[PDB]
Design a protein around this ligand. Structure first.
Ligand SMILES: CC(C)(COP(=O)(O)OP(=O)(O)OC[C@H]1O[C@@H](n2cnc3c(N)ncnc32)[C@H](O)[C@@H]1OP(=O)(O)O)[C@@H](O)C(=O)NCCC(=O)NCCS
Ligand SMILES: [Ca+2]
Ligand SMILES: [Mn+2]
Ligand SMILES: [Mn+2]
Length: 220
């Protein structure tokens, strides 16, 4: 009953854990990326990359470092796209081949009200009204935040540009899907235009998981 596997296609292997296994180490090449980090950050980085390597192995890729660009993005092997996420109680990764999909993003958040002031900072005025109308019993504010982070993680590998919280309007459906409508220039590095993403979401084990897969376009 893994959360990521419930919201991504079977051809994108994923792996997740809810605690840090004792005794894990980063690969030597990864050490500089966390040398200056506090212990809690070191731990989540080590465990999430353990998960990423598990998923990469399903695609036939043996142990390899997963470095980080200046903008925080993971640096995957040739022919691979992927995404990683962590919060207290979760570490998870998903990967796929570039011959199968264009991009993936995931994000995991505790299923709790957002911290004070965060909703006001991340939601467009219309989004605020939309969330207030969704059915009682789900922290739609936290879901919106989670979906916005996933939107950026799917966007950056295709554009090399920032996407602020105000730059996409996310509409959440109670049925486990959402849509992200881009409000800024959507030109992508492959010469296409990104205007909207389709997302999926699930709540289980006290957690929200959101995911976006950006499909390849049909042969022209
Ligand atoms: O919110 P989360 O903490 O779950 O997401 C952080 C993750 O998003 C991912 N991320 C960060 N910046 C990113 C970017 N610009 N593009 C894509 N993914 C990004 C990273 O994998 C990061 O975890 P890491 O620093 O351990 O690799
Ligand atoms: Ca960079
Ligand atoms: Mn995190
Ligand atoms: Mn997050």
């Amino acid at each position: 009953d893994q959360l990521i596997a419930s919201v991504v296609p079977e051809l994108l292997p994923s792996a997740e854990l809810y605690e840090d296994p004792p005794g894990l180490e980063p690969l030597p090449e990864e050490e500089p990326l966390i040398a200056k980090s506090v212990a809690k950050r070191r731990n989540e980085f080590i465990t999430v990359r353990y998960c990423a390597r598990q998923a990469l192995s399903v695609l036939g890729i043996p142990e390899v470092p997963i470095l980080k660009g200046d903008k925080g993005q993971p640096l995957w092997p040739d022919g691979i796209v992927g995404s990683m996420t962590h919060t207290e109680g979760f570490r998870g990764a998903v990967v796929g081949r570039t011959g199968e999909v264009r991009s993936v993003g995931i994000d995991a958040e505790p299923h709790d009200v957002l911290p004070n002031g965060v909703l006001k900072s991340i939601a467009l005025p219309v989004e605020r009204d939309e969330l207030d109308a969704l059915p009682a019993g789900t922290h739609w504010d936290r879901l919106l935040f989670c979906a916005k982070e996933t939107t950026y993680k799917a966007w950056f590998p295709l554009t090399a540009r920032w996407l602020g919280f105000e730059d996409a309007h996310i509409t959440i459906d109670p049925d486990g899907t959402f849509t992200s409508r881009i409000l800024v220039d959507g030109r992508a590095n492959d010469g296409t235009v990104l205007s909207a993403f389709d997302g999926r979401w699930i709540i289980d084990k006290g957690l929200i998981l959101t995911a976006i897969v950006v499909p390849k376009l049909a042969a022209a």
